[PDB]
Structures are given as C-alpha cells and as structure tokens.
C-alpha cells in the first residue's frame, strides 16, 4: 500500500511525500541555479555558492 | 524492540568511519554490546 499514492485508509504515503519533496525542494532549487546535474557523479551536487 | 534494533543498526552506517580514514591519511565499536560478562 505504501507504493500507491494513497493508502486504503486515506492518508499520505511515503511515495507521495517523496514525490512532493523532490518536485518542490530539489528540482525547484535547480532552476534557481543553486543546484546542478553532475553527470560525472550521476547525481545533483550543490554549487559552491555563498549561500 | 524495533526502536532499539534500529538504534543498534544505525551505528554500522559508513558515516561513522570517517575518523578512522582521517587518522590513517593524516598520520565502543559494534559487537561489544553483545558480550555477556
């Protein structure tokens, strides 16, 4: 049931929370230039910005 | 019991071995709690 976007009882599941976090904190920050896609490490790495 | 087991297990994560790598380059452990004196 954790795989579905909503469990039987009708509460948020881990998959939905992870999707929301990834779409609203990780990918959103990339558009601001604070994070970039590093193909060498096959992962997103924070830039060496002052913030 | 699950909380205790998770607390025991988290000690095995790689992040706890940084000090050992640093000591060798710049030159308590699990299992002890299971010994029954």
């Amino acid at each position: 049931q954790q795989t579905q976007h909503l469990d039987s009882h009708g509460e948020p599941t881990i998959t939905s929370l992870y999707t929301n976090w990834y779409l609203e904190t990780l990918l959103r920050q990339v558009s601001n230039g604070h994070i970039a896609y590093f193909p060498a490490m096959k992962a997103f790495v924070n830039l060496p910005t002052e913030n | 019991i699950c909380t205790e087991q998770c607390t025991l297990s988290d000690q095995l994560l790689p992040k706890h071995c940084a000090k050992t790598i640093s000591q060798a380059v710049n030159k308590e452990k699990p299992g002890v709690e299971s010994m029954r004196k």
Binding site: - | K15, A18, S22
Partner: protein, 79 residues
C-alpha cells in the same frame, strides 16, 4: 591504453558507489579523498579504422579482450 582505460573506469566505478556523507565528513576533518580526473577515452574506444601501413586495425577488439582479461583477474582476486 587498455591498462589505463581499465584503471580509470574501475576508479570511477569505485568512487561512484562511495558514500557522499563519508566524503563530506572526511573533507571537513581534513582527509579529503581526491576525485579521479575526467578523460576522453570514449573517442578511442569508438575507433575501428586505425590505418597503419595499409592495415586496418580494430582497436576496439583488442581493448575488449584486455578489459575482459582484467575483469576476470579482478573477479578471481576478489574470490
């Protein structure tokens, strides 16, 4: 060329799986693990028309044989 290609690929593979938190902790403590510099071996890997004295040499086949031997040796060493 085959030896250095295999070494670079193995080093990159090993670095990829290394925990990032451990690397950050080591860097903070003063024991940074240097990353492997990038390389452009793919161009040589995709070469099948090396011409020398009228001979066409399939460099890819030789590199494949060498990497296969190296992988077998590494697996045997691990076992």
């Amino acid at each position: 060329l085959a030896d250095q290609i295999f070494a670079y690929y193995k080093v990159m593979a090993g670095s990829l799986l290394l925990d990032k938190r451990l690397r950050s902790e080591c860097k903070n403590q003063g024991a940074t693990i240097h990353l492997p510099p990038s390389n452009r071996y793919e161009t040589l890997l995709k070469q099948r028309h090396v011409q020398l004295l009228g001979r066409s040499i399939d460099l890819n086949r030789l590199i494949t044989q060498r990497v296969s031997a190296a992988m077998y040796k590494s697996l045997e060493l691990a076992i």
